Paper text:
Here, we capture a structure of a RanBP2 fragment that includes its SUMO E3 ligase motifs, two FG-binding regions, and the last Ran-binding domain in complex with SUMO1-RanGAP1/Ubc9, Crm1, and RanQ69L(GTP). At the center is Crm1 bound to one molecule of RanQ69L(GTP) with SUMO1-RanGAP1CTD/Ubc9 and RanGAP1GAP/RanQ69L(GTP)/RanBP2 RBD4 subcomplexes on the periphery of the Crm1 ring. The RanBP2 FG1-IR1-M-IR2-FG2-RBD4 fragment wraps around the complex with the two FG domains, defined as FG1 and FG2, positioned on opposite sides of the Crm1 ring. The RanBP2 IR1 motif is bound to SUMO1-RanGAP1/Ubc9 and flanked by disordered segments that link it to FG1 and FG2. Residues from FG1 interact with outer helices (A helices) of HEAT (Huntingtin, EF-3, PP2A, TOR1) repeats 14–16 of Crm1, burying ~1280 Å2 of combined surface area with several hydrophobic FG1 residues acting as major contributors to the interface. RanBP2 FG2 includes six phenylalanines and one tryptophan within residues 2841–2881 that engage Crm1 HEAT repeats 2–7, burying a total surface area of ~3630 Å2. The GAP domain of RanGAP1 is bound to a molecule of RanQ69L(GTP) that in turn interacts with the C-terminal RBD4 of RanBP2. The N-terminal RanGAP1 GAP domain is tethered to Crm1 by its N-terminal helix, which occupies the hydrophobic Crm1 NES-binding pocket between the A helices from HEAT repeats 11 and 12 and overlaps with Crm1-bound NES motifs from protein kinase inhibitor (PKI) and Snurportin1 (SPN1). In addition, a new interface is observed between Crm1 and the SUMO1-RanGAP1CTD/Ubc9/RanBP2IR1 subcomplex consisting of the two C-terminal RanGAP1 helices (residues 557–585) and Crm1 HEAT repeats 5–7, with additional contributions from Ubc9, interactions that bury approximately 1960 Å2 of combined surface area (not including the RanGAP1-Ubc9 interface). Crm1-dependent inhibition of ligase activity in the presence of RanQ69L(GTP) suggests that our structure of RanBP2/SUMO1-RanGAP1/Ubc9/Crm1/RanQ69L(GTP) represents an inhibited conformation for the RanBP2 E3 ligase, perhaps because IR1 is less able to dissociate from SUMO1-RanGAP1/Ubc9 to accommodate charged SUMO ~ E2 when the NES of RanGAP1 is stably bound to Crm1/RanQ69L(GTP).
Numbering used by the authors:
A (entry chain B): 7 to 179
B (entry chain E): 2841 to 2881
C (entry chain A): 9 to 389, 401 to 1052
D (entry chain E): 2507 to 2517
Write the structure that this text describes.
Amino acid sequence: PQVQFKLVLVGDGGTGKTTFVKRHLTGEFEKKYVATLGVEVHPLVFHTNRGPIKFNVWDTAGLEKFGGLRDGYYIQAQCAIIMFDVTSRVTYKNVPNWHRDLVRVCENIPIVLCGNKVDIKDRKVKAKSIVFHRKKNLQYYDISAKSNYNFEKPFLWLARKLIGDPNLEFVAM
Amino acid sequence: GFGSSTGLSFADLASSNSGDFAFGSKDKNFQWANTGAAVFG
Amino acid sequence: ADHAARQLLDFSQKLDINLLDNVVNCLYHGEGAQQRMAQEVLTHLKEHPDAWTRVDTILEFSQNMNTKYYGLQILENVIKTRWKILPRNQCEGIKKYVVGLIIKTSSDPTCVEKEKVYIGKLNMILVQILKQEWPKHWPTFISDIVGASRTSESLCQNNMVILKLLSEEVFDFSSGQITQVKSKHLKDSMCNEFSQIFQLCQFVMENSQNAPLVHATLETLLRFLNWIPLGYIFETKLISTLIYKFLNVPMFRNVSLKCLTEIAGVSVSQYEEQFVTLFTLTMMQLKQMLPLNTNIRLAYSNGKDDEQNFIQNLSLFLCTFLKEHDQLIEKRLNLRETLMEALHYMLLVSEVEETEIFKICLEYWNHLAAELYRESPFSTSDVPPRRQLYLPMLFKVRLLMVSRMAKPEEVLVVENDQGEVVREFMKDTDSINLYKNMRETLVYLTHLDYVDTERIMTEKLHNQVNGTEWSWKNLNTLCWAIGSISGAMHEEDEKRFLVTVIKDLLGLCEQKRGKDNKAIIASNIMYIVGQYPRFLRAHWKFLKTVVNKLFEFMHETHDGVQDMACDTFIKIAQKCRRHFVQVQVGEVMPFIDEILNNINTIICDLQPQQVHTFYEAVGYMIGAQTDQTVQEHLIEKYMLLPNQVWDSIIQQATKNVDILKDPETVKQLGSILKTNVRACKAVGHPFVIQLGRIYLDMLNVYKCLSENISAAIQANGEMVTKQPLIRSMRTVKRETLKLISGWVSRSNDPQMVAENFVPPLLDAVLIDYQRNVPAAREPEVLSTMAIIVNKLGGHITAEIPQIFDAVFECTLNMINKDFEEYPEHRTNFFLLLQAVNSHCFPAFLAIPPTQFKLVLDSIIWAFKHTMRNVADTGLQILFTLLQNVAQEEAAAQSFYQTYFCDILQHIFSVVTDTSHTAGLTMHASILAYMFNLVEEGKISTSLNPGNPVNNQIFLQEYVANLLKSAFPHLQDAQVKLFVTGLFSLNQDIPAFKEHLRDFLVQIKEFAGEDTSDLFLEEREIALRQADEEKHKR
Amino acid sequence: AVVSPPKFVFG
Ligand SMILES: Nc1nc2c(ncn2[C@@H]2O[C@H](COP(=O)(O)OP(=O)(O)OP(=O)(O)O)[C@@H](O)[C@H]2O)c(=O)[nH]1
Ligand SMILES: [Mg+2]
């Protein structure tokens, strides 16, 4: 694909960034937790009705030990996904910090707040308590890398914002 | 030391200028662009 | 070029800017292994002590802007960590260099416009230097920066950015990054000097004609509004300036409305006329830019991002201000029109097809409906004074709720690890929350006036039948709205409304042609019928007719009809289960007998999962038969076909066990076991007849399949686990375990269960689990036992040693090599350990001391995991174990002498680790419980075998040496202060947690011999006050 | 008997 966009995937550790990227990349679900060291760059390709759209996802490390060149990974980024975990309140309490670090480098970019692991019955971060995205004008989606719930909605919204085509849709090819 | 610099400083800038500001003074009959335009259109 | 890349770390010759630029470009513009190599090289270079000395060159020669950012990262790391140990001359040099760079690059519009990121990094570095050094050694920063802001507009803009960054880092993002004493000192210092950085904002907002400068000033005011004293807000002309000078300007709408929303969220009584004038003026300034006759739906649908952001901000402002000061607005009589127009704007914005905006509007609608209902829950007649205000516009809210009703159920087709597609019903998602909020609002409004809601629904239904508004989604929305108000009307009103609605829908079903339209109409009719169980229970002929009609739809091959029939049937069975077992008027036999007699003719065309659902639904009707012998007969007749198939398969296998390897018979076994699981779930304890009928054969087939799987995996590797036959065998094993655990969870006779059903498991399932190869072991075995231990509890305490000898050693050896492999085994193993600890603690007194040491070591290994669930389970197990040991004062002293110091050392090992902060709360509890447990003198025996010494002294010395040796850069004074706080705040968990966070912050920085940030006196006074409060209690 | 004997016994 010629149209390439840089996506920055940030969030606490264990929230499911690597699993979320791997499900799109290969369709397999990872059950073990291997902490990311620094950053891993993965190209994802979607086929919209208007052609191929490519995201160079920079999956970062949410652990402070393995941060690396943390805010230096956000330079020249064009879209972002901040992921937290609905089974852990601490992950949602840290979303403001990730958003701060992200917007101090990228003043105006599309941002999607994804609450992962919604297929687990014991949900700690209830839907009513997720109100951060409002005053920040971010999108919000409940996803699940294990059940493929709202699986492609974050990327679909980001593609619509970046391309500028509200009537864009993904067609499998 | 760390890169001995000949640059200026906030204290020096503050001393040079008195309480008077270097900005504008709301020139007569000045309004921002599109003052009062409808949100949609 | 690996050697060339890694040459950067030599630190022997002058830095090579070309090589650094090349590696940085490779990092940001690399394809494969080059990018990773550059990343690793740069990470190693960043974390090299004394590397900051090269930054002064990187910022002077390198032209690439991504390498100057890297040098700034190195410099910022040094400033954050080792500022207090650098000599004063170097600190002054760095400060002067950074300030000079900021002044130089912020005075030229070209550079500020071009970079926009290097300047931000410089500002952040200055803010870090301020946090390190601002008030103590930089008394005149605010006076100078404000004084320097009068020299140029670009300088003023950059200074505004600096001020907002400082405000954020001091007031918004201070927790977890600054100690409490230092954060309070900074907050007081900034609040004292804020009267001067507010004259600058007022002057800029009232004299400046530069758009970016004024926008920056407003952006920083938005941040200042979070914490500044209210006197600066309501006792000046800030609100009027925001409303008139900037709200109307298109390029200042959004930030001005954000500032007004921040102001409107302040709930205080001293200022109430300012809120009143904040509303009337804002509304008058809002109807000159958003006319009341605007179709915000269409306009928003095709509009720029600025306009959409403005619409969202307007919804937020209206919601916030109304929720806060609706009482104030209502009290004034002459403001009635303004309130009505604000509600009209809220109604207009509710039509926008954006989920977030609709949720923002819906929360206010729900708030208003709940308030009106709590005022008086009776239908309108007099009328309550506050309800009369909203009467002219409540029918509009009712129409909105009926028109945009959300889908009640969310069904997702998901395939598990065994490639079995199933329909999952998501339960607590965001869409379900939206539907629940809409249902609650509509129910409140219907309680306020049911006639109007009935009229709205009737008018919409009429618009559907005549065809002027026919559509599948419209009919679905109308039927969801009708079904959402079940139970909100009196029985007779509900009966009449249902008769009308169902009669009209049936009339429309014949009218519409085509199979799909009729299927949609029938599905909607069945959904409505299933949502009003009271109507069905009242009338038996209608219920029987509906059940027969559902049975007829089970032979329909049209897509989505059989699923709808099964869902409706299970709902009706759950809600009206008692009208099938009992004999009705005009019926010679119960309906359940009729269903059971001809059941093979009903499920003939159903798919296996639909058959499972039907069996569950029929089971819900057999648990309602109170009589014992009758229920036994029903259960025997209810499980006739599965028993026939199971007996056939078992008799066939008795001849030769080789049939079980045939995939078809394994599929049959899996289906039969799923049917049994569903029937057990539906029925409950009375299912013991079937369970005891099939128990031993089920265990034998489980053992055979487990041995086959283990042999296959051993002789062919772990790749075979993805074959269809191995998948089927694993499915059969998991269904067997699910059936056993599910019945045990619902039994009502622990003694009988322990005497009959448990002993077979040890030989069949646990020893088989032990004998399997590690890659062929079922983690579910470890969870099933947990479910048993949580149920039988004290009745299964005599068999805990056997269960441990079976599973504990093998699982622990399987999961004690790292923290990654076998996640399911880790989770279930520690859940089983938690169950045993909670319910069967005396079992730990029967196992040998070595096995207890192994158990405690495994518990310690639990909370060192980076997996949150496993670490949380480990912390819970440790806390419960400490509490249980405390009760038994006999062995408590031996346990303390043996493990108190080790447990304390490990807890401190995980506390001072940044990867476990998510568990800090539990760390606050356990530690507290331990330290308190020693301050009350519960540890009678001395913890130090060397000589008898007071425990509260020995522990202080032990912890001080433990922390000093682990973090030698800490000063003795602050270590002693931390230990004193540990021994003082042990009965105030939130204060203890704040203490731990402060220590975590402290251990990250090298203070050398500087006491300017410790504030020993203030913290000592605070600890003394806490101790006095504890003593008073 | 609460638990019936096993027709199929796997050695
Ligand atoms: N139940 C459930 N578990 C999930 C889901 N998504 C991810 N996980 C689990 O969460 C764990 C952590 O996810 P990872 O992607 O590996 O961790 P990460 O997001 O990369 O975090 P870091 O690597 O530390 O930066 C994984 O081992 C998954 O097993 C989910 O949707 N449901
Ligand atoms: Mg990762």
